[PDB]
């Protein structure tokens, strides 16, 4: 695919935000990643907002 | 059988009866490696389940 493309991940489990800056999503939901970081939390966008989420709750939809 | 030993990276508090609570820095003897985010181990003679992403393997 196109190089250095923004990562696309799919939620594998439901998640309820524990903090204001965290995302809430349901299994099956698609998130566009804005920040990949070690430590178990990534940042992404979903449904119009940007927030943090558990990286172990998602699986990247890999190219190509 | 299992020669796998890991160290707790953070405190873990049980939320279910079969879970193995531990403190950061605890030494856990892994009894079963399983996919899903949870492994079984022994600390203080108690065997239970803990998050696999909460531990780091300790090499001999």
């Amino acid at each position: 695919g196109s190089a250095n493309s923004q990562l696309v991940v799919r939620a594998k489990f439901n998640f309820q935000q524990t903090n204001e800056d965290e995302l809430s999503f349901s299994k099956g939901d698609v998130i566009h990643v804005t920040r990949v970081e070690e430590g178990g939390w990534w940042e992404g966008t979903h449904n119009g907002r940007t927030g943090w989420f558990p990286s172990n709750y998602v699986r990247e939809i890999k190219p190509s | 059988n299992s020669q796998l030993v890991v160290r707790a990276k953070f405190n873990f508090q049980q939320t279910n009866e079969d879970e193995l609570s531990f403190s950061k820095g605890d030494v856990i003897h892994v009894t079963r490696v399983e996919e899903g985010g949870w492994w079984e181990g022994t600390h203080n003679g108690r065997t239970g389940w803990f998050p696999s992403n909460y531990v780091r393997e300790i090499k001999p």
Binding site: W41, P54, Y57 | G37, W38, N53
Partner: peptide
């Protein structure tokens, strides 16, 4: 049994 998120 969902995976446990690490502390932030």
């Amino acid at each position: 049994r969902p995976p446990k998120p690490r502390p932030r």
